[PDB]
Amino acid sequence: PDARRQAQLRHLLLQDCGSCHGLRLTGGLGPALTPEALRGKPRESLVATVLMGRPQTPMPPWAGLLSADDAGWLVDRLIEGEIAP
Amino acid sequence: PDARRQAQLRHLLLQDCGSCHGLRLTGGLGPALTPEALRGKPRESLVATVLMGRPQTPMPPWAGLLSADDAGWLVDRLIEGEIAP
Numbered sequence: 337p338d339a340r341r342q343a344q345l346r347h348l349l350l351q352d353c354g355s356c357h358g359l360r361l362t363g364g365l366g367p368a369l370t371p372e373a374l375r376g377k378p379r380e381s382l383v384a385t386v387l388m389g390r391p392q393t394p395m396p397p398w399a400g401l402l403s404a405d406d407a408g409w410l411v412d413r414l415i416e417g418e419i420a421p
Numbered sequence: 422p423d424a425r426r427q428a429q430l431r432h433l434l435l436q437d438c439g440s441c442h443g444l445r446l447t448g449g450l451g452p453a454l455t456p457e458a459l460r461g462k463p464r465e466s467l468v469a470t471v472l473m474g475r476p477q478t479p480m481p482p483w484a485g486l487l488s489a490d491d492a493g494w495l496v497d498r499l500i501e502g503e504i505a506p
């Protein structure tokens with residue numbers, strides 16, 4: 337499948353397959369962003385990490401693209417677990 | 422963030438953030454499709470399940486919408502932990 341098709345297939349993976357099979361950020365190079373792994377951590381601490389990143393790690397700063405509202409919204413979604421598109 | 426923006430953030434989370442933070446299809450009502458859960462099952466078996474579903478379950482068949490290559494690609498993504506590009 338070509339790049340255009342790959343994109344259509346990732347969408348299907350996230351919307352249709354993910355509906356029944358669920359979606360979770362179980363962690364790879366970076367830590368898990370599951371509600372269980374973020375339990376009890378100050379919310380503003382997680383928003384800070386998103387906006388400014390973590391120096392000397394692969395976690396980049398997203399302030400270049402995300403406002404403080406955007407980062408807080410994402411963090412709320414990670415805390416709830418409701419990451420489904 | 423407004424309607425259109427929340428969607429951008431959901432997409433960003435699933436396809437950009439999910440690469441490092443390990444997006445997986447698991448935690449839903451349906452079974453886990455993580456690499457750990459598919460480790461022993463043959464690829465052609467999983468591809469068959471995608472194309473033909475599993476009778477007497479809600480796992481539907483996808484052959485009409487997906488070619489054999491499409492299904493094999495999807496399975497590779499499940500196996501290789503590459504739901505985010």
Ligand code: HEC
Nearest residue numbers: 352353356357451452467470471475478479480481483495
């Ligand atoms: C609910 C309507 C589902 C949707 C939509 C999708 N899947 Fe599914 N899947 C579902 C169930 C209840 C089961 C288990 C069936 C059983 O009792 O054995 C499955 C199973 C699979 C498997 C097989 C996993 C295994 O261990 O053999 C695969 C490979 C799979 N599902 C993939 C898959 C894909 C790619 C989907 C989107 C195209 C998809 N499923 C949707 C429930 C549902």
Ligand code: HEC
Nearest residue numbers: 365366367382385386390393394395398410437438441442
């Ligand atoms: C690889 C290039 C990454 C991408 C892209 C994103 N994240 Fe990340 N993240 C990554 C690493 C290696 C780490 C750990 C850094 C360290 O100090 O060891 C992180 C960390 C986070 C955290 C903190 C989690 C915690 O338990 O405190 C969060 C909340 C986080 N990252 C969020 C996040 C978001 C929202 C991203 C997309 C906008 C994103 N990360 C991308 C690696 C990578």
